[PDB]
Write a protein that binds this ligand. Sequence first.
Ligand SMILES: Cc1cc(N2CCN(C)[C@@H](C)C2)ncc1-c1ccc(-c2nc3c(CO)cccc3c(=O)[nH]2)cc1
Ligand SMILES: [Zn+2]
Length: 210
Amino acid sequence: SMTILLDLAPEDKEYQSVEEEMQSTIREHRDGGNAGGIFNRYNVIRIQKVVNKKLRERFCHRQKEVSEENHNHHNERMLFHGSPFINAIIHKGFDERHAYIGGMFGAGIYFAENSSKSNQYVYGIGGGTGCPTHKDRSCYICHRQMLFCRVTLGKSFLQFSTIKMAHAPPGHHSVIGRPSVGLAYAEYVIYRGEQAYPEYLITYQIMKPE
Ligand SMILES: Cc1cc(N2CCN(C)[C@@H](C)C2)ncc1-c1ccc(-c2nc3c(CO)cccc3c(=O)[nH]2)cc1
Ligand SMILES: [Zn+2]
């Protein structure tokens, strides 16, 4: 459906809040930077607010159903999502028919509290072949994009190791993978696309350390 992208000004508190969450949640990955590249900082190019009436309608309708099953609590969290399918997401919304089958919690839609974890999926699973132009997973030239999303978690089912599932457990609305001594970083899983709204579209580069 019809999507409008509104540019946030770098001087605005809103743009600054999104960049602060993005920059401050960067951490070192176990693959030594193979999937997302080697960097300790991003160069934020643009931050846009995604406006889509039909997506907002579907998200708000689902929030009400979740609230009803969760003592009138949405349990909403702002979380990162990196994907080669950014264009489809901002126009058509998140779709569980395009879930990550290979995911450690089964065929769900995966979100991160660490921007660096989502950066590992911008070009595909495991970084795929990298940027389309230079076939480089650590490309410092190409402008990357990721989303900072409103995610309705409702009643979360907490897990610490791999358990493949198709849907959240009975009475639950999401699955959370927690880090332990185990997972390196937390993973947030929804099994219904309408439980996430792609609120912010961030255009950035990973920065090559000096
Ligand atoms: C589902 C899929 C198919 C595909 N394909 C292209 C080639 N082909 C067209 C098909 C084979 C299909 N490429 C990428 C994805 C995909 C996209 C994003 C993620 C993703 N995962 C995350 C995780 C998983 O642990 C944790 C934390 C955060 C994230 C995150 O932000 N994003 C996973 C997979
Ligand atoms: Zn490139």
